[PDB]
């Protein structure tokens, strides 16, 4: 229900309250990589790389198209297709 | 089936030294006789074969951590060419 390119709000963790694009999705581990969220400093042998580390998908939430408030997402059918729709408003999600 | 008989060329220092004497070394299927190897070489590389020498290699004991095992058993054929030449590279 959370896809690459989505605008998400971080609702738990160190960066709670920040918004970012979902760079990557790891469905097997149920984790996503959110740009600017959970920055790790790794010791590169052949400096100090600073790059995002994945966080659990349950720590991010989609933002409603209308109110721009976090919303759970349902599913509806329109001409034989499943479309994400917001709970808070009901408008289809991009 | 000729391309099933021959698996791969063997490129080693000894096999290169044999290549200098028009002898070509192949790993072959473990169930084939040297007549089949000669025919397969003739069909694939359009050369004349003077003789074929063949030998079997037992599985080699090998390990990766606590996992000890064996390599596959091998059959090695050395093919001496009467005429022609084989451009493996």
């Amino acid at each position: 229900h959370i896809k690459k390119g989505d605008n998400v709000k971080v609702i738990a963790g160190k960066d709670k309250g920040k918004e970012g694009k979902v760079i990557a999705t790891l469905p097997k581990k149920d984790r996503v990589v959110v740009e600017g969220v959970n920055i790790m400093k790794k010791h590169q042998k052949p400096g100090i790389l600073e790059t995002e580390a994945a966080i659990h998908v349950s720590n991010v939430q989609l933002l409603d198209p209308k109110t721009n408030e976090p919303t759970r997402v349902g599913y509806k059918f329109v001409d034989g297709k499943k479309v994400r729709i917001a709970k808070k408003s009901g408008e289809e999600i991009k | 089936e000729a391309r099933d008989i021959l698996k791969r060329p063997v490129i080693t220092e000894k096999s290169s030294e044999a290549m200098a004497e028009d002898k070509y070394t192949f790993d072959v299927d473990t169930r084939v006789n040297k007549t089949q190897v000669k025919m397969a070489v003739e069909e694939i590389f359009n050369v004349k074969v003077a003789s074929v020498n063949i030998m079997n290699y037992k599985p080699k004991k090998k390990r990766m951590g606590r996992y000890q095992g064996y390599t596959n058993k091998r059959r090695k054929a050395i093919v001496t060419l009467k005429e022609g030449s084989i451009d493996l590279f």
Partner: protein, 64 residues
């Protein structure tokens, strides 16, 4: 590719099987001499042969 194979005559399937087995043989020899480096071609040809033999058997079982 099964759709593309299905439009070939039985003899043509046999002709493509032989040439695919020839390309596969050439790839293995290149790999053994450290000259291929394009290793994904091996599995592609292997599965293509499998598809070609699958259809040959399918039609050889519809005819009988």
């Amino acid at each position: 590719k099964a759709k593309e194979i299905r439009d070939l005559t039985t003899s043509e399937i046999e002709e493509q099987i032989k040439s695919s087995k020839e390309e596969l043989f050439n790839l293995r020899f290149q790999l053994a001499t450290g000259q291929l480096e394009e290793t994904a071609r091996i599995r592609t040809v292997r599965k293509t042969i499998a598809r070609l033999k699958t259809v040959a058997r399918e039609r050889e079982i519809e005819q009988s």
